[PDB]
């Protein structure tokens, strides 16, 4: 989680997409979705980003109706963007046991619990906290036997991206957990 103001230039697709969902939190205005293979994910906006601007006028207080209109009604060849990199979110740095354990319990993406003696503790996990990325990888939708076959297969660092449930929940709300699943990029970043 960088604590930086970053410009980014957008330039929509052959359809006029970026890929992008905006969602209203506490009169910011915050990334709800990012699409696979989309002008959003190759500039490399990422779920929870903070979009400060949208061609040099202010966000704050606009409606999740108003962002995606105005994103409408731009012209598509430059759509610059100012973004605070992913202001809600913390990330925690652990290593595994011998027998491959960071060491915690999670359901639904959220951590219900944490074991003691685990890096997990040693380097304070909290609960009701999403996992929102894991390793630079947003896995935001993915089911928890998934998120697992990930940390299995993840060298002995492991990497993880937590955001507090009560915000989390309030990003996703009106947003189908088909498309969470389906369409959000769960990808390494290309290069
Ligand atoms: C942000 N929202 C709700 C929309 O963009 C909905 N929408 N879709 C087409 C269309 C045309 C004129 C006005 C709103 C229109």
Redesign the pocket.
């Known amino acids: 989680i960088k604590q930086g103001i970053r410009e980014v230039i957008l330039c929509k697709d052959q359809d006029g997409k970026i890929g992008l969902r905006l969602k209203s939190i506490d009169n910011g205005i915050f990334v709800q979705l990012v699409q696979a293979n989309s002008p959003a994910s190759l500039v490399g906006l990422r779920f929870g980003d903070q979009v400060l601007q949208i061609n040099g006028e202010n966000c704050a207080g606009w409606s999740?109706?108003?962002?995606?209109?105005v994103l409408?009604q731009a012209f598509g060849e430059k759509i610059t963007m100012t973004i605070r990199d992913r202001p809600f979110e913390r990330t925690i740095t652990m290593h595994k046991d011998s027998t491959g354990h960071v060491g915690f319990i999670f359901k639904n993406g959220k951590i219900t619990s944490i074991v003691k003696d685990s890096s997990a503790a040693r380097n304070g996990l909290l609960t009701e906290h999403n996992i929102c990325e894991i390793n630079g990888q947003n896995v935001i939708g993915l089911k928890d036997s998934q998120i697992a076959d990930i940390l299995s297969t993840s060298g002995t660092v492991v990497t993880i991206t937590i955001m507090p449930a009560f915000i989390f929940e309030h990003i996703i709300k009106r947003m189908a957990p088909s498309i969470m699943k389906s369409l959000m990029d769960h990808t390494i970043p290309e290069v």
């Open positions: 999740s109706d108003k962002a995606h209109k409408k």
